[PDB]
Design an enzyme around this catalytic site. Structure first.
Site, PDB file in Angstrom:
ATOM      1  N   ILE A  90      12.566  15.650  13.563  1.00  0.00           N
ATOM      2  CA  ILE A  90      13.474  16.586  14.215  1.00  0.00           C
ATOM      3  C   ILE A  90      12.703  17.811  14.734  1.00  0.00           C
ATOM      4  CG2 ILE A  90      15.181  18.319  13.605  1.00  0.00           C
ATOM      5  CD1 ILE A  90      15.320  14.544  12.872  1.00  0.00           C
ATOM      6  N   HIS A  91      12.898  18.136  16.036  1.00  0.00           N
ATOM      7  CA  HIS A  91      12.230  19.224  16.758  1.00  0.00           C
ATOM      8  C   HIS A  91      13.208  20.251  17.349  1.00  0.00           C
ATOM      9  CE1 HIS A  91       8.505  17.124  16.383  1.00  0.00           C
ATOM     10  NE2 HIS A  91       8.594  16.386  17.473  1.00  0.00           N
ATOM     11  N   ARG A  92      14.363  19.800  17.857  1.00  0.00           N
ATOM     12  CA  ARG A  92      15.152  20.573  18.806  1.00  0.00           C
ATOM     13  C   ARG A  92      15.964  21.684  18.148  1.00  0.00           C
ATOM     14  NH1 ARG A  92      15.133  18.073  23.706  1.00  0.00           N
ATOM     15  NH2 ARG A  92      16.292  19.773  24.709  1.00  0.00           N
TER      16      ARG A  92
END
Ligand SMILES: [Cl-]
Ligand SMILES: [Cl-]
Ligand SMILES: [Cl-]
Ligand SMILES: [Cl-]
Lengths: 360, 364
Positions: B207-209
């Site tokens: 997960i990045h966003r």
């Protein structure tokens, strides 16, 4: 007060178009205008007389850029124009024509989410070697509103996938300016007096393109033709300095005493000239349209012209400098012609229609 | 006698595509390569590693531009690049993707009548408020040769008036790169050794966003779900540093102890994890493509993806993080699915094609 419309300009025709737009805007209260000139504050491209005579507004900003390569000029203009946009936060940005300045203004605005309208959109030569072709294509595809001068322009944009609702056929605002300056010259130019000429009683010539001014035979064929044409009709030739010094360099400065050779003339007097001539002979693309605007037949000494629709409505004729006999005769023929009575570039109120589409 | 081919790169994906291209060109005679980076020459060890691990050529120029506005970055890049083009006089300029660097490179070249090829042409979001949509549109229009990754990109280009004779369907260069880095990982990476896992025996999550990371409801859902999946199949979770901050601050730190949570891994170790995963869970556009490249079923925890074609081909699946039990379930379902056996982004030889054309040797 209620809407800010900022114009970017960095060539003489763009100032002329921006001024024609501004004649309409300045009559609505609560349009504030801002004029950004990309070039040098006192550029010698232009004169006090260009500003006074053609009724050009004093820029609010001069970014001071020019004299470089396309990369240097365009890069610097993109930075500097963006800065003004960020400072002035206008509602609309108007860019004009197809120079590097046009493209800088559009690219600067579109990345800032500031709506851009391109005045004179959709013109295509279909030759991406011309820097102006790249400029107009990229401006068009970056703009929100595309003010085309002709139906070909409109179709050019649609063929490129631009949605119809961003394209408005408004005509050429240089026609509006031709009319404004036309009236003004009738009121003020006296160049007919001082030359001792009669309206509809002379031929006007300008020649200043390379393809003709370099080659020596060509400039013979051209000046030998104008010589012979002078016999039937007074020929008036305002000679681009550069074209003079090319003729004095084949000694041809003798085929120039028979004709009323002149040293380049004031802008209003030149309008007077254009609009009162029985024929205009030229290789300039601008003068070809001015001819049409004033309904004066045109011969184009060029072997190629760009305004094919003037040829098709028989207002302009292509006569490639092969020999003087062949050329002087076709000059004389066309001098007694006219074209179809069709409006090609709007009705002379392109400015109005642009203005209406904006102040909406 | 040679062709000189100058690449302009400004972001990491462009370097990767360029280096893909340069691996093919180096085997060829009479090729001169010039690599122009528009950003800075970085000394640090981090950047050195990226160039070493991912086999990126040492640039010939670093123009040292970045960090300002669109107009500043782009206008300065335009002048500095042109300056380089005026000295090197290449037969071709290659520009890549859709950053200001891409666009500056194209505009520099076209006005000097230096032919430009746009690697990755024709992609359209149809949202002109995106700066990158402007970059690709004007680049594509400024370009002589358009290397499109997909048939959809080709139609996008045809619909905007661009002649067929300038458009080549060659595939996505990043696919070629994924395959090469995949082979390298299989050779060199010991991350599976260290984690004591087996190929196809874990789930990988990234997960990045902001939309996920910066929202308690959404990150709760995700961590609750991964922890539940971890009961059926181990979950390996390289947690973004920002992502962890949020988790702890939100008081979800315990769920990270419940999966195999790691600090961010090396590029090649990450390639290894992705390609040997049974399933990937992500909100990254890049990762979604890499899942497909390695033929690993993907789940995108997000309300939409760029890559609709991966939805259609059943390689990827949208599961918005609304309910922990739902996302768990979805994951455990999708993990034993596969997509249609079809190439979407070329055959992994986009580089060859590109190279072949620029050398006037014909495409195979
Ligand atoms: Cl112009
Ligand atoms: Cl930015
Ligand atoms: Cl990119
Ligand atoms: Cl070109």
């Amino acid at each position: 007060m209620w809407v800010k419309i900022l114009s970017v300009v960095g060539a003489r025709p763009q100032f002329i178009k921006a001024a024609a737009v501004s004649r309409v805007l300045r009559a609505s209260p609560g349009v504030r205008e801002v004029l950004v000139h990309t070039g040098q504050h006192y550029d010698d491209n232009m004169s006090q007389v260009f500003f006074e005579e053609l009724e050009i507004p004093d820029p609010d900003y001069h970014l001071g850029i020019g004299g470089g390569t396309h990369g240097q000029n365009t890069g610097r203009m993109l930075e500097a124009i963006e800065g003004v946009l960020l400072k002035e936060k206008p509602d609309w940005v108007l860019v004009y024509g197809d120079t590097d300045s046009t493209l800088a203004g559009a690219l600067a605005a579109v990345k800032l989410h500031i709506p851009v309208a391109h005045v004179e959109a959709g013109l295509r030569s279909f030759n991406r070697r011309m820097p102006e072709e790249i400029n107009r294509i990229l401006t068009d595809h970056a703009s929100d509103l595309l003010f085309a001068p002709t139906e070909t322009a409109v179709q050019n944009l649609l063929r490129e996938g631009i949605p119809e609702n961003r394209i408005h056929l408004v005509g050429d605002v240089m026609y509006d300016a031709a009319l404004h300056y036309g009236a003004k010259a009738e009121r003020k130019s006296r160049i007919l007096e001082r030359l001792g000429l009669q309206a509809k009683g002379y031929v006007l010539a300008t020649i200043h393109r390379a393809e003709n001014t370099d080659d020596q035979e060509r400039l013979r064929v051209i000046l030998e033709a104008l010589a012979e044409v002078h016999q039937e009709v007074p020929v008036v030739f305002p000679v681009h300095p550069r074209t003079r010094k090319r003729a004095e360099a084949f000694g041809l400065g003798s085929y120039l005493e028979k004709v009323v050779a002149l040293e380049p003339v004031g802008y209003l007097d030149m309008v007077m000239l254009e609009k009162n001539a029985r024929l205009i002979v030229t290789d300039s693309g601008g003068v070809q349209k001015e001819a049409y605007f004033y309904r004066v037949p045109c011969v184009t000494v060029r072997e190629e012209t760009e305004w094919v629709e003037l040829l098709k409505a028989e207002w302009n004729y292509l006569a490639a400098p092969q020999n003087a006999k062949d050329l002087a005769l076709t000059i004389l023929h066309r001098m007694r012609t006219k074209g179809v009575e069709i409006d090609l570039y709007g009705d002379g109120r392109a400015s109005q229609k642009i203005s209406d589409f904006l102040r909406k």
